[PDB]
Design a protein around this nucleic acid. Structure first.
Lengths: 56, 56
DNA sequence: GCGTAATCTAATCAACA
DNA sequence: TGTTGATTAGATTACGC
């Protein structure tokens, strides 16, 4: 079975979109910073960035 | 920009290889169980399983 | 129901002994 | 220098709202 679908609120999405507009390929440091900031596991943020680059 | 390379000891590798021989496609439950068991983040275990299925 | 999170493979890079 | 963990680009499948 798959994990439960991670849900992002308005603030988390806004922060992630700003970070994406700054750099679409964030290193491990910035990814972990975003993880601690919006309280979302770093793996989920990496998946989000991959999907975001995929739609764009 | 990459994360530090995850290092596995003998026991972690043994448990992961046993789980792989049992099921090469573990669900989220089994992955999180292995994560809690060998104390390694679930994303690292998913990456390890992907690489293992890739080289075999 | 749509958007998008999650997952898999295939290919490539690089780092820690 | 080698093994193998880490990353990314595509295709998918399938929940959360």
């Amino acid at each position: 079975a798959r994990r439960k679908r991670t849900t992002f609120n308005k603030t988390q999405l806004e922060i992630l979109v700003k970070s994406f507009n700054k750099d679409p390929y964030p290193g491990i440091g910035v990814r972990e910073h975003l993880a601690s900031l919006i309280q979302i596991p770093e793996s989920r943020i990496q998946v989000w960035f991959q999907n975001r680059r995929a739609r764009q």
